[PDB]
């Protein structure tokens, strides 16, 4: 399946593994292309946005860099969406430092938030909800935890992405 990849920070594709408002976390097994049921959120929570990963990249944890795709609608898990970066969320968990790219679907797809140029263009409310979600969505999971540092603009996200792309190429 996965063989297409576009890596432009303003036209990079994200593979949705989790849909917005969903409490079921899926994970794609690149070899089988099979959508795996990784887990069901322990608490009365649900993802604040569409969750996925950028293919052909290597993040800090050995897996392709993760990315959250913000929008009013929830994309189907297993679907792919061309998006653009606007920032990045830095946090720390039991495994180590974790980086999560903040993206929005490209305008030719969905222009509801075309006005969002950088991380600071997203409303305060949304950022707090997302940050609070990650800071607590693993509270009830034994020997698991998260400590959110904060967000960083688009320029910072591009570097995370580019570094993740090179790591996969060598």
């Amino acid at each position: 399946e996965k063989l297409e990849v576009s890596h432009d920070a303003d036209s990079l594709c994200v593979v949705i593994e989790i849909s917005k408002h969903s409490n079921i976390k899926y994970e794609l097994d690149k070899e089988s292309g099979a959508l795996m049921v990784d887990r069901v959120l322990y608490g009365a929570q649900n993802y604040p946005a569409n969750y996925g990963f950028v293919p052909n990249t290597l993040g800090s944890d050995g897996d392709p860099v993760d990315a959250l795709v913000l929008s009013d609608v929830a994309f189907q898990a297993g679907s792919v969406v061309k998006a653009r970066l606007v920032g990045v969320l830095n946090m720390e968990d039991e495994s180590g430092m974790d980086e999560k790219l903040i993206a929005l679907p490209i305008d030719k797809i969905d222009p509801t938030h075309s006005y969002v140029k950088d991380i600071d263009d997203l409303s305060k409310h949304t950022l707090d909800k997302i940050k609070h979600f990650f800071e607590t969505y693993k509270d009830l999971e034994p020997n698991k935890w998260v400590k959110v540092k904060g967000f960083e603009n688009k320029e910072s996200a591009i570097k995370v992405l580019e570094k993740a792309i090179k790591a996969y190429q060598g």
Copy 2:
């Protein structure tokens, strides 16, 4: 509207103001009978059960004692359901000590959890989810907070209810 009340701990009625899986907290204005939109949860959360109150009772905060109605389905806000007590959840918030009765719809209505005789019959998972919800659903709300103490069996809940009924009668 509200004029019917049954107060038996095994056949008391609860007025649903919030449906399960909903992130919108409603509140009934007894005088108008109008379903009021109290607030939309700040975080990416949703109620772990149906939320309502027992009419003709007076809780610690001056309002009718609150009660959570557990079940697999979500009841419509504004609807009334005959339930039975199985326990009570004790917590503390910015306003003071808060008590929330834990109930289940009576069997002639829905017998999915008829096997649940006491608080300890509910699975550990469910109790942790409910407790975690209340312990965090007000994190992002300025000058608001909650500090959950724990659960107490049915015998303890009956006393809370009976005390709440007498307080309203005098």
Copy 3:
């Protein structure tokens, strides 16, 4: 609340107590106007249509004559809808002979099935689903049962309605 009633067989109003696709059966307490949670279907079923009753009428069981409002959408329980009769479903349960009027919302409201003039205009599939639902939705409920006889055209339904209206007037 309830004080408005229109009784024309082609413009009679139905008070929705159950929405289509819902497994939760509500019942309106005319005195309180409170939407009561009567029960949650024991089996893996859901109503094949919107369920309600015609106000100011007296059916065979002492309660206002029941009526099913067919349409593609599900109406909110507690809402009222002006409909027109097209037939009636005759069945027998533990309480006795039961009659359920088959109606459709008036065209100025929803004209999706304006072509349905009589019971025989509804597709075979829909009629079997509705009949099968009632014939089994009470299988798991102790000491409760249903034995569906069949459907009868519009002319037959009008007589059921008119008889139900007179019974309430005297």
Copy 4:
């Protein structure tokens, strides 16, 4: 039921008759307090926001002034929400000139769009969707039509509201 009214442009209450994403248009019969099913949208559409009316006011068409309550969530029809004005949408239909207030729930309820101070703060996308909805949601309804003029800021909306309040008082 309806007896409470707050009329401050920044704390006025709206009675929701239609929930966001719903294709079923409800209408409240003030006398009965009964939620009436006015109609089901003829086309493959759904309201771009929560639709309701401000009580104790008299709009251009003889009924209480209408108002759209924008938010990410859909409020239950029949519920009441304290909101604040940010603008107004002017249009023309078969009945005459129609005015629809554009509002947002007050922050103590839902602060997702607290940053929206005036009509021009809402994204272009949202305004076009709302305008396009009204400009076409009545295309298939015989002898019915709409011709949207445009939006007007908050200062303009306040005057519409205040004029609607006085009209009801005399």
Copy 5:
């Protein structure tokens, strides 16, 4: 993935890319088999039916002939459904003449509309909704438009299909 194709006008398979009531338009990348997020409807609309394409065919626009699968339920995007033709919808857009086959799932799958033998058997309401959807679902999309001509019976649809099958074979 795609290697199975049945081409009988009464047993041809359609690959669902869009589910009924959905506002998210997906598109399958035959090479990757990856479900692509093509776009989110600009207006407050949603598809009047399941949308997909017939594999191993070549339509007027160079892509496999499109087909709408009508039914009461919404099929999951990426799923395949054996259907039968009943007509075809002719329209014109910025790209040129567009043809969209009107189909229904075969009876051994879903017999709700088995009575529909030809395009004229579908209710007027449904046809107008579908036609109105296409005539306006691209209004807000810059440099894009649609001008619906009308529907044509089953005999006409078979010719469109057969012509689309031959075009792919040579």
Copy 6:
């Protein structure tokens, strides 16, 4: 796609073809990996749990042994979930004797029912609903029927699974 299989009775994987509460029965075509729409339930019913099959096994009917995955949430059709056995449901249909494994997702995925060690740990209500579903979900389907025998503990299910695994290996 399908090439991964784990066969431990406490860590065996199930390929979800039907999600809980869904009335649409999907079936995976192992060769194409295409999710096929097998049928839409004739009656007003919906699956009491997630339905799927264990890959690399051969059941009594020539197809991989079937298994129901119980949980509070509905898994997406086409997704895979690691589960554990707790029992088996024996029934008879027009094709012959049918066996359906009763499983629960492994705890590292979803521990809501970790307390369920054997078939007898599941509530009576749930078992009756599941049994009643299968005993009637094919009533309206011509020349099709089911006659449920009953449930059998985990030890019995393991033998069914192991026998199904060997049958596929030779």
